[PDB]
């Protein structure tokens, strides 16, 4: 179970990154739906709660729009790129840790 | 110290988009005789600021 927890920290980080990526993809796909509210989650607090069933928050709008659509484009695109990069970083960290654990048994 | 680049560039993109929106609004309402209440339309423009928590991205203060 020690191995379980030691890899569990990074596994949960990766899982939350995947969930945030899914939400970003959803609000990209629905970017032109009138009456839509941009949704996002707070990664740090969510990870803390999971380590110690996911709630999502409404993104603060930046400009008004008559059709009731508040999901911006540039901010969420930068968020998408950042989330993808951090997901890849978590993936490679987990892979390095697993390979280091494995090669000891050789 | 390399993940702040995304924040800086995103702030720049948002500020430029806001400036473009303001310019488009001015061009559209170049010949607006009146608004809803009755007061004549007045040209608007943004006011940038340095988004330093030291230098960082650009940030729009108000209109």
């Amino acid at each position: 179970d020690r191995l379980d927890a030691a890899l569990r920290f990074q596994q949960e980080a990766l899982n939350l990154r995947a969930q945030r990526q899914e939400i970003l993809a959803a609000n990209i796909a629905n970017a032109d739906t009138p009456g839509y509210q941009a949704r996002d989650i707070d990664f740090a607090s969510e990870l803390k709660k999971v380590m110690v069933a996911v709630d999502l928050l409404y993104r603060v709008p930046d400009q008004p729009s008559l059709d009731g659509n508040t999901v911006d484009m540039d901010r969420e695109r930068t968020q998408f790129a950042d989330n993808s990069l951090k997901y890849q970083m978590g993936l490679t960290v987990l892979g390095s840790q697993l390979k280091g654990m494995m090669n000891v048994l050789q | 110290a390399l993940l702040n680049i995304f924040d800086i560039a995103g702030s720049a993109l948002a500020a430029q988009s806001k400036r473009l929106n303001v310019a488009a609004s001015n061009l559209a309402n170049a010949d607006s005789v009146t608004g809803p209440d009755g007061q004549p339309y007045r040209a608007k423009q943004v006011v940038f600021q340095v988004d330093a928590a030291a230098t960082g991205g650009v940030k729009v203060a108000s209109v």
């Binding site: 707070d42 928050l57 409404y58 603060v60 400009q63 008559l66 009731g68 508040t70 | 948002a14 809803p36």
Partner: peptide, 21 residues
């Protein structure tokens, strides 16, 4: 707060009145 941040409750509806009553 600052645009692009996160907040607990949603934005109010946006309206474009042609003439104020």
């Amino acid at each position: 707060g600052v645009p692009g941040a996160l907040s607990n409750q949603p934005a109010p509806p946006n309206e474009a009145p042609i003439a104020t009553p």
